Design a protein around this ligand. Structure first.
Ligand SMILES: *[C@@H]1O[C@H](CO)[C@@H](O)[C@H](O)[C@H]1NC(C)=O
Ligand SMILES: *[C@@H]1O[C@H](CO)[C@@H](O)[C@H](O)[C@H]1NC(C)=O
Lengths: 51, 41, 50
């Protein structure tokens, strides 16, 4: 369950990233991915680091 | 950098002083383009 | 034609228009009497004739 944190900002289709996110499931992987979904507004480096 | 924003930048700061890579400080100042002079580096 | 840098980090993307000018002043800056004596700067603004 390897974690990966996906992050977007602004107008974007989250359910599409979810779509392709579930679309790919392959035993070719020797480990299962742990899919995560995240979004944010501001570009300020500090708060970016924070989240 | 966290304490630079919260503690420092929030104070409407013209300059900062640094000693000891301390480089992150400059990263912050630079995203703010704010001149800062330390000592020891 | 002077301004002030932003207070809060959040939501502020605009660099302070005068910062570079302030820098150049720091470049031209020559202090005759310091505690350590005279202080100088190079092309990169670094202590010279130390
Ligand atoms: C992002 O911005 C929208 C509107 O611009 C706002 O409703 C939302 O609360 C913001 N996100 C956070 C985490 O505050
Ligand atoms: C910004 O500063 C310049 C330099 O002194 C001066 O022309 C004026 O204060 C401002 N610029 C304009 C076009 O008004």
């Amino acid at each position: 369950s390897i974690g990966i944190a996906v992050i977007l900002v602004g107008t974007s289709d989250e359910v599409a990233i979810k779509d392709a996110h579930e679309k790919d499931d392959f035993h070719h992987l020797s480990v299962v991915p742990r899919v995560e979904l995240v979004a944010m507004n501001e570009t300020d480096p500090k708060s970016i680091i924070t989240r | 950098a966290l304490s630079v924003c919260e503690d420092l930048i929030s104070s409407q700061v013209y300059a900062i002083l640094v000693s000891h890579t301390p480089t992150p400080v400059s990263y912050t100042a630079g995203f703010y383009r704010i001149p800062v002079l330390g000592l020891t580096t | 034609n002077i301004t002030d840098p932003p207070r809060g980090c959040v939501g502020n993307t605009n660099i302070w228009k005068t910062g570079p000018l302030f820098k150049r002043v720091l470049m031209s800056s020559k202090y005759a009497d310091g505690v350590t004596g005279r202080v100088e700067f190079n092309e990169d603004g670094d202590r010279k004739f130390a």
